[PDB]
DNA sequence: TGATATGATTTCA
DNA sequence: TGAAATCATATGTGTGAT
RNA sequence: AUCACACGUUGUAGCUCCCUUUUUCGAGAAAAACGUUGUUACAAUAAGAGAAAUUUCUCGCAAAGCUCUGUCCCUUGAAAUUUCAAGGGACAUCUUU
């Protein structure tokens, strides 16, 4: 029937158990039904230990900031050609730039040093830019291009900064006053493409910076509330402000005037309130701020116009004669309002004093599975993670066997919340208040060491199952058998397979950041500079230059043995090739068959991330055809398979002639027949140069291949290689079979 | 409607939002996206003055470009929106 | 500070 | 003489406000 | 979460150091191509999509999910082993975005 059981779960950083319990009346454990563990990513960044999310975030703002700084370029395009200016600059920008200040400067020139304003603008990095300034205060030095002309390219001899050394750095404030000072000589010198109008266009420009908005974007919009059917009120209102205070005898009403945010001497800032306070004590205008501050109407209103409108004349037609001329003037220019509050401003007016005296909006105006863990409020990623994960078992187990008795949780902030969720959400079949039963697994881990299965936990992911079986005390044959063995029926309901997450996700990184030349591709190499802080014995005899020039060549064999190879010490004091110039980087060869054309054609990377691969056979053969994120990208279907001794120029193409088995996704479960050996496991990656695929065995046994990987293991010879798949529960392991080659977009 | 500085917060509520979220893929994401982009140039068009590296004649012209070009992206978002079968 | 793509180099049928 | 394992080897970074 | 700055890398171009090749003048150099040190500028800095209309906006390395669309499984039933009805899942190329 409607078994009753305790589920338990064990949560972790890249694994959740779980392990079904069987009980009865009394609530004393028995023997198990069957166990499991849903292996998944580490939620982190495994190289930096930062979050997942997070290099998202420095990619979409590296992409905003060359958008933003792209766009700017165009509208100074689009300045230029307006004036008739722009009409192959001319590259010497800093020496035109000194030019500048004495003598005219023609119209390409002029145009050069125009827009290497506008993409460099400015402003370690500090210590920089104040020495700059510092410098900047001398009669020598008129100009930051100046200060580049006449003192950087003497001592250093490059005006740029190169590998940090941000000594070069200048402000936003001192090229405007290039700007400004050039376009004053231009004009003295007689430029007639120096006019005034263009100079405010480009001094805006230079100096326009898209505000912080941060936030939600959902918040900025004007509700409703449904309650007044009117419009929403705004978060920055007196009364909205009292709202999240009250809510947060007499006495303290008036104590957020007191102090301008609270601490711990007298305990929520009452920031709009104090930010006007600021404004207005800013001038001489205390008289009127005295009148202002009884009033919480006028502040209603303020705070309404101020988050609803945002030109000068809207807020001076709505806020006529609510207030002076002085004080409005003084109000609109350092106000700033923004975002609303959950409820209305008649709403607000009806609550406020019941709740200063939701029950105050009252008196005025599933079960069966547990739900979705909420995101918003979690906000560590690899506790949500783990949540995830714990709630997709826990659906799981209660779909195949029924409602649960008892929830206990063994954490392996985190264990208090998922508790209070699962009693607060989820119906379950306890008996009493004790629903979730969160407890430390040391004390049982030790009781439990008693009846003897301790130094157990090894890198396979079958250890991890016991932290979850240890639920019946919060035998050991038995157990032993049902997790560790790979056949309990043979040897004493089912062997414990690991399910780990599928990782079908067909999006990622499309290359490698580093980018490598593509002019010799066709060789199968590329070339690339690398600086000789990091140039060892190796990538000197991948130079491009070994034969052509020998000279250099020679000389870096006897600097590198003559500081034993420590390319940072050999070179940390500037190398003197034959005609005296300096060496920092040279250009050396890689071997580079297989990448991503990238740079609009120009430069070529590797291949960063496999999304799928596509199995198939051809007479007898198996054939695997790599897809990689670049291809979804670009909406291309490969069918040109993973062959030996061969660049991708000729590899065997998949025709009519080649049957189509299956898709091939990271973590997907396979069953590979040869020879030699048949295993069963889980497909982590495909070598484009040898073919294999390097399957892993579905709980990592360190026994099993390297480290727990089948590395290297082919399928061109194979009997039979299928596709397997198995449910979230490691269970109904069954025979895959699609029926159309599905496209990658 | 035809969009303006001052009614612009009276078309940009949630609720058109919400009622834009029935459109295909193709059409909506275009739609919403230019819908969110000219909420967020506009809820802070007087940012401009909170920062003391901006002079009150320069942050003034930076207020009408985050109200115009605001209220132009809401516009196109709206015009589309018509055009399908939202209005 | 680590998975991931993949290339050279052997070992096997 | 191809197919399969094996062992190596590189992999974008630092600074300052909101 | 958000906005900028400084690099770095790739392509191009200028100057610049050393240089392989083809010749010419006649050891040494003028010319041509390629490699390439340093330096500057420009273009790009994911691969790319969606909707309008020389250009604009949004999305584009992450997480969650079933409101919509899909590839399969699990149950159930109607019609000539097949097409379909309904419900429940695993995922996503689908939604938050």
Known sequence: ?745 | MKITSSNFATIATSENFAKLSVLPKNHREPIKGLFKSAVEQFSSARDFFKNENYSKELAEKFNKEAVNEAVEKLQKAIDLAEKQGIQ
């Not at chain 1, 004053?184 to 120096?194: D, E, K, L, V, W």
């Not at chain 1, 109008?197 to 004007?222: C, F, V």
């Not at chain 1, 929520?268 to 006007?276: D, G, N, P, S």
């Open chain 1, 1 to 745: 029937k409607n078994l009753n059981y305790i589920l338990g779960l064990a949560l972790g950083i890249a694994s959740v158990g779980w392990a079904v319990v069987e009980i009865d009346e009394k609530e004393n454990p028995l023997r198990l039904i069957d166990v499991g563990v849903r292996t998944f990513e580490r939620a982190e960044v495994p190289k930096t230990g930062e979050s997942l999310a997070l290099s998202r975030r420095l990619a979409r703002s590296a992409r905003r900031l060359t958008q933003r700084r792209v766009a700017r370029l165009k509208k100074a395009k689009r300045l230029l050609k307006s004036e008739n200016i722009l009409l192959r600059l001319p590259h010497q920008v800093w020496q035109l730039r000194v030019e500048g200040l004495d003598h005219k400067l023609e119209r390409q020139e002029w145009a050069a040093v125009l827009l290497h304003l506008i993409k460099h603008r400015g402003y370690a990095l500090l210590s920089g830019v104040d020495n700059n300034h510092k410098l900047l205060q001398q009669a020598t030095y008129r100009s930051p291009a100046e200060l580049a002309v006449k003192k950087f390219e003497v001592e250093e001899g490059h005006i740029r900064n190169q590998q940090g050394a941000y000594t070069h750095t200048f402000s936003r404030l001192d090229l405007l006053a290039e700007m400004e000072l050039l376009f004053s000589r231009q004009q003295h010198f007689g430029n007639p493409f120096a006019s005034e109008k263009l100079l405010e266009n480009l001094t805006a420009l230079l100096m326009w910076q898209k505000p912080a908005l941060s936030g939600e974007a959902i918040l900025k919009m004007l509700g409703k509330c449904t309650f007044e059917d009117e419009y929403k009120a705004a978060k920055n209102t007196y009364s909205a402000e009292r709202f999240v205070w009250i809510t947060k005898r007499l006495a303290l009403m008036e104590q957020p005037y007191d102090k301008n945010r609270l601490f711990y001497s007298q305990v929520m800032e009452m920031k709009a309130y104090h930010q006007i306070r600021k404004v207005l004590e800013g001038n001489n205008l205390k008289a009127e701020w005295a009148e202002l501050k009884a009033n919480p109407t006028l502040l209603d209103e303020i705070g309404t116009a101020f988050s609803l409108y945002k030109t000068d004349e809207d807020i001076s037609a709505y806020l006529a004669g609510k207030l002076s001329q002085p004080v409005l003037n003084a109000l609109l220019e350092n106000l700033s309002f923004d975002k609303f509050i959950q409820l209305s401003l008649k709403a607000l007016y009806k609550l406020l004093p019941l709740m200063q005296q939701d029950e105050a909006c009252r008196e005025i105006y599933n079960h069966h599975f547990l739900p979705q863990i909420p995101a918003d409020e979690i906000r560590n990623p690899v506790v949500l993670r783990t949540l995830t994960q714990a709630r997709k078992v826990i659906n799981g187990v209660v779909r195949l066997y029924g409602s649960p008795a008892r929830i206990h949780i063994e954490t392996g902030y985190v264990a208090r919340f998922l508790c209070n969720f699962i009693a607060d959400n989820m119906h379950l079949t306890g008996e009493g208040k004790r629903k979730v039963f969160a407890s430390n697994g040391q004390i049982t881990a030790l009781l439990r060491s008693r009846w003897g299965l301790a130094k157990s936990r090894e890198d396979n992911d079958r250890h991890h199952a016991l932290d979850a079986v240890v639920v019946a005390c919060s035998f050991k044959q038995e157990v032993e058998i049902r997790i560790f063995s790979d056949n309990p029926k043979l040897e004493l309901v089912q062997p414990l397979f690991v399910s780990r997450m599928p990782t079908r996700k067909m999006t990622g990184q499309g290359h490698m950041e580093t980018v490598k030349s593509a002019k010799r591709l066709n060789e199968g190499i590329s070339v690339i500079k690398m600086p000789l802080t990091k140039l060892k014995l190796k990538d000197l005899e991948l130079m491009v230059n070994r034969e052509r020039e020998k000279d250099l060549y020679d000389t870096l064999k006897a600097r590198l043995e003559a500081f034993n190879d420590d390319p940072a010490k050999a070179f940390a004091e500037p190398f003197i090739k034959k005609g005296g110039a300096i060496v920092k980087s040279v250009r050396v060869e890689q071997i580079q068959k297989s990448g991503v054309l990238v740079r609009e054609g120009n430069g070529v990377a590797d291949n960063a991330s496999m999304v799928r691969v596509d199995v198939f056979t051809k007479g007898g053969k198996y054939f695997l055809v790599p897809i990689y994120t670049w291809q979804v990208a670009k909406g291309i279907l490969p069918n040109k398979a993973a062959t030996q001794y061969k660049d991708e120029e000729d590899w065997e193409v998949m025709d009519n002639s080649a049957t189509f088995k299956f898709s091939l996704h990271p973590n997907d479960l396979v069953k590979l027949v040869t020879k030699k050996k048949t295993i069963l496991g889980y497909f982590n990656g495909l070598n484009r140069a040898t073919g294999n695929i390097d399957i892993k065995e579905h709980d990592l046994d360190k026994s099993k291949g390297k480290q727990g990987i089948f590395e290297g293991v082919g399928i061109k010879l194979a009997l039979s290689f299928e596709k397997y798949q198995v449910d979230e529960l490691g269970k109904n392991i069954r025979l895959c079979k699609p029926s159309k080659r599905q496209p990658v977009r």
